[PDB]
Amino acid sequence: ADTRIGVTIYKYDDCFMSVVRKAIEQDAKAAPDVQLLMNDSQNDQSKQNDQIDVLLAKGVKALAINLVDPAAAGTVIEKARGQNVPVVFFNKEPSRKALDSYDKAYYVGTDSKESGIIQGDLIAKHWAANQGWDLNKDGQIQFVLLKGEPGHPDAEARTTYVIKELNDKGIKTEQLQLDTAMWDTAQAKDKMDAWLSGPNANKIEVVIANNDAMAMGAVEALKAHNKSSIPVFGVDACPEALALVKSGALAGTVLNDANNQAKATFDLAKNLADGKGAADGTNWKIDNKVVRVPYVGVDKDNLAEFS
Ligand SMILES: OC[C@H]1O[C@@H](O)[C@H](O)[C@@H](O)[C@@H]1O
Ligand SMILES: [Ca+2]
């Protein structure tokens, strides 16, 4: 009969996870034997926990879980273990210890630091090509940074590695501001607006955001202050962001490959639901229960390949 797979998305109103959610539903449409039970956890781990209980009570044969809280992986694993059901975590990466605590736990995502390195290289390229961006002519990038959720592996790695990569390439940096905007456009717009309204706003040379949603908020705040001359960099290559790379409102971004992350999540979940090896009949390379999908930098010079 039909194989039910339970899926939780941490919040449907996340740009990137909306792409992933839709892609996984398209993938399921192409598997006549599988029924997806899709849940919006509304950015609340307690809601997600209850949703998982309901899915397990409905007899799902696998779970695909996009955690609200990464630290809740253990909690979720113990729920799955109660039914001896496999779980494919995706996009918010559990700790190695959590993954190793249950032989039926897997993870699909990315090499988080790669996105930071790529973003840093993009900034380095554009900085070298636009020395007018060095407003105070000190040879250093005076930056502000809009961080994702504290503790989220992508937020932590993108924040560390964008700056490390710039510095390693011989570009000194001065952090003027850094705060979280929780992956959200409105929070980022308000934070950027505050920074532009504070004393020494005039020192800001480059805006770095851990994702496109926050970058797009910054773009709007810059526009409101007639400061669009300041470049903004993001991560994801969300559809709206690519339009802004085209228009010049966004200086660069980094494709976070939602389509392939969705496909790997679905393929592994379906195999595990069927009691097969996770990668059976696929080309996915699973390394110690993890699949990582490459990022790719995007700017006007290669936009034609992504538009
Ligand atoms: O967990 C959700 C987050 O995942 C990250 O990989 C994406 O870059 C963000 O846009 C998204 O908000
Ligand atoms: Ca400078």
From Swiss-Prot:
Keywords tagged on the record: Calcium, Chemotaxis, Metal-binding, Periplasm, Signal, Sugar transport, Transport
InterPro entries: Bact_Solute-Bind_Prot2, MglB-like_PBP1, Peripla_BP_I, SBP_2_dom
Gene Ontology terms: cellular component: ATP-binding cassette (ABC) transporter complex, substrate-binding subunit-containing; membrane; outer membrane-bounded periplasmic space
Binding positions (beta-D-glucose): 14, 91, 152, 154, 158, 211, 236, 256
Family the UniProt entry places it in: Belongs to the bacterial solute-binding protein 2 family.
Domain notes: The calcium-binding site is structurally similar to that of EF-hand proteins, but is in two parts, with the last calcium ligand provided by Glu-205.
Subunit structure: The ABC transporter complex is composed of one ATP-binding protein (MglA), two transmembrane proteins (MglC) and a solute-binding protein (MglB).
Protein name: D-galactose/methyl-galactoside binding periplasmic protein MglB
